Design a binder for this molecule. Structure first.
Ligand code: ATP
Ligand code: CA
Ligand code: CA
Ligand code: CA
Ligand code: NA
Lengths: 359, 140
C-alpha cells in the first residue's frame, strides 16, 4: 500500500509516491477549457482553450478546476486508483479552515481515498533539511512565506506572507528585456522568459556595485539561444530581476524585501529561540534557486542582527522539491500515518475532522 | 494545541523503540535504518557510521534535584548520511520528545561539529566508514 504525496503549488503540481527521493510527476497547475485539459496538453491546445490557475498565492480558489488538477494527477499522470492509496497533501501556512475541509471532502467523497492528511509545507521542508528548529523561507511561483519552527512546532503568530514570487519575476524580466529591444509577448514567448530567468539570472551580492560593473564592462553579459535560433544577449537584467525579492519597489510593490520579512519573523518569536533561528534559515521553493541568493541573504541578515550573532543560510540543492521530499519522508513513517484520517473516521465525522488530526 | 498534543502523544505510542526509554540515567542510542528506528547494541555505543543518522537520548539527574530524570535528546547526522535518514532522525527526535512529555531538549549534531554536551557523553567516540543504505527509491 504505497502512500501518495501530492504537493500543490500556485504554478506547479509535485506528485509521486512516499519513499521516492523525487516527485515522479511535475506539471503546470493550469486548466484549459474549450474557448477540460490540464498541464502540457492544455498548453499545446492554447489556441482553442482558456487557461486558468486554480491556486492563487498558495491558496486554492477555483475548486472545480482544482478537482480537475487532482483527477489529472491521479489518473493521467501517476495512473493510480486513488481508492487504493493513502494520500498526503500539503497546504500553505495559515490556510483557512473552510479550504482544508473542502480538500478533505473532495479526497474522500470524490476520490474515495482510504486515508488522508494535509501537512504544513514549510514544516515538510524543514524536516527535509534534517532539522526540527529553524526559520523556513519558502518562495514559489505565487507566494513567499517565512515560517519559524521550534522543536517540530511552527510558531503561527510569527509567520509572514509576501505576495511576490516567481511569476512576478518572470513578468518583470519580460518588461526589462524590452530595454535592449527584445519583445516577449505571447505565452510561448513568456515561457521562454521564465527559462531565461531560471538559467541566466543571479542575485547580486552588492546590487549598486554590480550595476556599476555592468555599465563599466561587458563581463556580466550572457548569451541565450531562442528555440527559433535567435541569440539574444542579457546584461544587468540578470541580477535586476531577482533583486525585486530584496527591493519589492522594483515592481511598484510597497513591501519589505525577503531579508526584512525574515528578520521581522524572527523578532516576533520569544527571545530565547531567536539565536537558533538565525543559525537555521532554510530556503525552499523554486524562487530561492537564484545563484548568489544565499550569500546575499547572509549579508543582509548580518546587517540587521547583532554583530556577534552566528547566522547561517541553508540552501539545499534540490530545494525546488524540498516540500515534496519532506512529505515523502514523513509519509514513509508508520507513526505519522497513524495520525491520518481514515475513510471510516470521515464517514462518521465529516470534513471537520482535519482540525482534530492534521497539524 | 492540547488536542494537537494528544494526537501527537498518541502517535508516539506506536513506536516500539521508545518502550522502556528514559527509564534510568544513561545513554540510549538508535540508528535510522530504511526509515525505521533500530536500537544500537550496547557493544557498539559510541561508534557512529559516517553514512548514517542516529538518535541519542541522554538521561541524567538535573542540578535542581538529584532524584529526578532530565533528558537531552540529540540526533546525530553523519557527513555522508542521506536525506531520508536525516529527516527521519529529525522527525523521530520530535516524536520521542512528545513521548517523554516535551521534557527533553533537542540538539542537532553533525559529524565534526558536535556540541560539547554531546561529546561529554563518551570518554570513546569513534567514526566508522560506511553505513546502512538509504531507504529512498531513486527516481531515474
Ligand atoms: N533555477 C531557478 N531560478 C529561478 N527561478 C526558478 C528556478 N527554478 C524554478 N524557479 C521558479 O520557481 C517557481 C516554481 O517553484 P515552486 O514549485 O516552488 O512554486 P509553487 O509551489 O508552484 O508556487 P507557490 O509555492 O508560490 O504556491 C517558478 O516561478 C519557477 O520559474
Ligand atoms: Ca509551493
Ligand atoms: Ca546511510
Ligand atoms: Ca522538548
Ligand atoms: Na511533467
Amino acid at each position: 500500500t504505497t502512500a501518495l504525496v501530492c504537493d500543490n503549488g500556485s504554478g506547479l503540481v509535485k506528485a509521486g509516491f512516499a519513499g521516492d527521493d523525487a516527485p515522479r510527476a511535475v506539471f503546470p497547475s493550469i486548466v484549459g477549457r474549450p474557448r477540460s485539459y490540464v498541464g502540457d496538453e492544455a498548453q499545446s491546445k492554447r489556441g482553442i482553450l482558456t487557461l486558468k490557475y486554480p491556486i492563487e498565492h498558495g491558496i486554492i480558489t477555483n475548486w472545480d478546476d482544482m478537482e480537475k488538477i487532482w483527477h489529472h494527477t491521479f489518473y493521467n499522470e501517476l495512473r493510480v486508483a486513488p481508492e487504493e492509496h493513502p494520500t498526503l497533501l500539503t497546504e500553505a501556512p495559515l490556510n483557512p479552515k473552510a479550504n482544508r475541509e473542502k480538500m478533505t471532502q473532495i479526497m474522500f467523497e470524490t476520490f474515495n481515498v482510504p486515508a488522508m492528511y494535509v501537512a504544513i509545507q514549510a514544516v515538510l521542508s524543514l524536516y527535509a533539511s534534517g532539522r526540527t528548529t529553524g526559520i523556513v523561507l519558502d518562495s514559489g511561483d505565487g507566494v513567499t512565506h517565512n515560517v519559524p519552527i521550534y522543536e517540530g512546532y511552527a510558531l503561527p503568530h510569527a509567520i509572514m506572507r509576501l505576495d511576490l514570487a516567481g511569476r512576478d519575476l518572470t513578468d518583470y524580466l519580460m518588461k526589462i528585456l524590452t530595454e535592449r529591444g527584445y519583445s516577449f509577448v505571447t505565452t510561448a514567448e513568456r515561457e521562454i522568459v521564465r527559462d531565461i530567468k531560471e538559467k541566466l539570472c543571479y542575485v547580486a551580492l552588492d546590487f549598486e556595485n554590480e550595476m556599476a560593473t555592468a555599465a563599466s564592462s561587458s563581463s556580466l553579459e550572457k548569451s541565450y539561444e531562442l528555440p527559433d535560433g535567435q541569440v539574444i544577449t542579457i546584461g544587468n537584467e540578470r541580477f535586476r530581476c531577482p533583486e525585486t525579492l530584496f527591493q519589492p519597489s522594483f515592481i511598484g510593490m510597497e513591501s519589505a524585501g525577503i531579508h526584512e520579512t525574515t528578520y521581522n519573523s524572527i523578532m516576533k518569536c520569544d527571545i530565547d529561540i531567536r539565536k537558533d533561528l538565525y543559525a537555521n534559515n532554510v530556503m525552499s521553493g523554486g524562487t530561492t534557486m537564484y545563484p548568489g541568493i544565499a550569500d546575499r541573504m547572509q549579508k543582509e541578515i548580518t546587517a540587521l542582527a547583532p554583530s556577534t550573532m552566528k547566522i547561517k543560510i541553508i540552501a539545499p540543492p534540490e530545494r525546488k522539491y524540498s516540500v515534496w521530499i519532506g512529505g515523502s519522508i514523513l509519509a514513509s513513517l508508520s507513526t505519522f500515518q497513524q495520525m491520518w484520517i481514515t475513510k471510516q473516521e470521515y464517514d462518521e465525522a465529516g470534513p471537520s475532522i482535519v482540525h482534530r488530526k492534521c497539524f | 494545541t492540547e488536542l494537537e498534543k494528544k494526537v501527537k502523544l498518541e502517535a508516539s505510542q506506536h513506536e516500539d523503540a521508545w518502550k522502556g526509554a528514559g527509564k534510568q540515567v544513561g545513554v540510549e542510542i538508535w540508528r535510522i535504518q530504511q526509515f525505521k528506528v533500530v536500537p544500537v547494541p550496547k557493544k557498539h555505543h559510541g561508534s557512529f557510521y559516517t553514512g548514517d543518522s542516529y538518535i541519542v537520548l541522554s538521561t541524567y539527574h538535573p542540578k535542581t534535584n538529584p532524584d529526578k530524570l532530565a533528558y537531552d535528546v540529540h540526533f546525530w547526522l553523519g557527513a555522508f548520511t542521506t536525506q531520508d535518514e536525516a529527516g527521519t532522525a529529525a522527525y523521530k527526535t520530535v516524536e520521542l520528545d512528545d513521548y517523554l512529555g516535551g521534557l527533553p531538549v533537542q540538539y542537532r549534531e553533525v559529524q565534526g561539529y558536535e556540541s560539547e554536551r554531546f561529546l561529554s557523553l563518551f570518554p570513546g567516540l569513534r567514526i566508522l566508514d560506511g553505513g546502512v543504505e538509504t531507504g529512498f527509491h531513486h527516481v531515474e
